[PDB]
Design a protein around this ligand. Structure first.
Ligand SMILES: O=C(O)C1=C[C@@H](O)[C@@H](O)[C@H](O)C1
Length: 164
């Protein structure tokens, strides 16, 4: 089981914090988005655009599930994997670290540069949709709104200790 499963919206710094946290812990980093491509020989765009979301999510959940069983390090979850009820089910009992930001801060950082003229509106809609799901599955919630990456990581490590 992973030491930490990281979840967050675009703009939360999830990739960056995952790399940093895995380096602080001395553990493997598995990015589920990368694993799908490594396993399918197809890009995310190509799967998502060709097969459609439902099939992408089916593929994702299978990869998420395997990693949850196999990976002992940090697992960085693709941003929409939480939208699948089976992912939310499989997550239960894991350490799930939610890299939490406000929608205003998301928009400030991105936004929604992560669609055409409406992309900001869709990004506002994306986070209204995903953020309650991240809240639901979290076991640790970390306000990354104003912390730097090293501070977020220091905060996480102090709440993931192991006896003695
Ligand atoms: O928010 C999303 O739905 C996605 C985010 C990325 O992690 C990829 O899994 C893909 O672009 C889908």
């Amino acid at each position: 089981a992973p030491k930490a499963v990281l979840v967050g919206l675009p703009g939360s710094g999830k990739s960056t914090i995952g790399r940093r946290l895995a380096k602080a812990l001395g553990v493997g980093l598995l990015d589920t988005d990368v694993a799908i491509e490594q396993r399918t020989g197809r890009s995310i765009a190509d799967i998502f655009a060709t097969d459609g979301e439902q099939e992408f999510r089916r593929i994702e959940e299978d990869v998420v599930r395997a990693a949850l069983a196999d990976h002992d390090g940090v697992l960085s979850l693709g941003g929409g994997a939480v939208t699948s009820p089976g992912v939310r089910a499989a997550l239960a009992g894991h350490t799930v670290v939610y890299l939490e930001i406000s929608a205003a801060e998301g928009v400030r950082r991105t936004g929604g540069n992560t669609a055409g003229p409406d992309r900001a509106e869709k990004y506002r809609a994306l986070m209204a949709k995903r953020a309650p799901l991240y809240r639901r599955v979290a076991t640790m919630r970390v306000d990354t709104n104003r912390r730097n990456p090293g501070a977020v990581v220091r905060h996480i490590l102090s709440r993931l200790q192991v006896p003695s």
